[PDB]
Write an enzyme that holds these catalytic residues in place. Structure first.
Site, PDB file in Angstrom:
ATOM      1  N   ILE A 118      11.960 -19.779  27.951  1.00  0.00           N
ATOM      2  CA  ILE A 118      10.550 -19.395  28.099  1.00  0.00           C
ATOM      3  C   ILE A 118       9.613 -20.502  28.559  1.00  0.00           C
ATOM      4  O   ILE A 118       9.568 -21.573  27.962  1.00  0.00           O
ATOM      5  CB  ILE A 118      10.021 -18.872  26.758  1.00  0.00           C
ATOM      6  CG1 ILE A 118      10.995 -17.809  26.220  1.00  0.00           C
ATOM      7  CG2 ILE A 118       8.598 -18.335  26.934  1.00  0.00           C
ATOM      8  CD1 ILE A 118      11.018 -17.665  24.683  1.00  0.00           C
ATOM      9  N   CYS A 119       8.851 -20.234  29.612  1.00  0.00           N
ATOM     10  CA  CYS A 119       7.939 -21.239  30.123  1.00  0.00           C
ATOM     11  C   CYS A 119       6.535 -21.096  29.552  1.00  0.00           C
ATOM     12  O   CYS A 119       5.741 -20.304  30.035  1.00  0.00           O
ATOM     13  CB  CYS A 119       7.881 -21.196  31.653  1.00  0.00           C
ATOM     14  SG  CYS A 119       6.884 -22.555  32.304  1.00  0.00           S
TER      15      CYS A 119
END
Length: 148
Positions: free
Chosen positions: A84-85
């Site tokens: 996840i960014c």
């Protein structure tokens, strides 16, 4: 001995859970959690339930929790390995934050993909120029990989 903070956060996570999210310590080890997040209603992910793994490193809360989607998902800010960014998981983390804070941000990210982010993956272009097709693919992938 297990840090008191971890015991307290875990108790709160299982006693008064956030709507749409479930978090339970995997086996007897309190540093490993199995998390599920319902796909947001009115999003291409609405028919499924997504599974994530969350680990509290030895230096937590000075180090951010490590989290990854187990469920394969078609989204511009989640890579092919389920990473996840979000800055809150990287440089903006601090001991003032809690596990609950991170899960809430992840849940919001599912509901509001941001293809314009400079770090978005390669589906970003599809999401922007062919949104109906991109959302359709995201729904197909929910059907194929998520729990119903």
């Amino acid at each position: 001995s297990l840090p008191k903070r971890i015991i307290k956060e875990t108790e709160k996570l299982v006693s008064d859970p956030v709507p749409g999210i479930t978090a339970e310590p995997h086996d007897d080890n309190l540093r490993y959690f199995q998390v599920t997040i319902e796909g947001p209603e009115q999003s291409p992910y609405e028919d499924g339930i997504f599974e994530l793994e969350l680990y509290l490193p030895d230096d937590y809360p000075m180090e951010a929790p490590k989290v990854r989607f187990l469920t394969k998902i078609y989204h511009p800010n989640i890579d092919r390995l389920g990473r996840i960014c979000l800055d809150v998981l990287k440089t903006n983390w601090s001991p003032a934050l809690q596990i609950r804070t991170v899960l809430l941000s992840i849940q919001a990210l599912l509901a509001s993909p941001n293809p314009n982010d400079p770090l978005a993956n390669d589906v970003a272009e599809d999401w922007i120029k062919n949104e109906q097709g991109a959302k359709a693919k995201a729904r197909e992938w929910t059907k194929l990989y998520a729990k119903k």
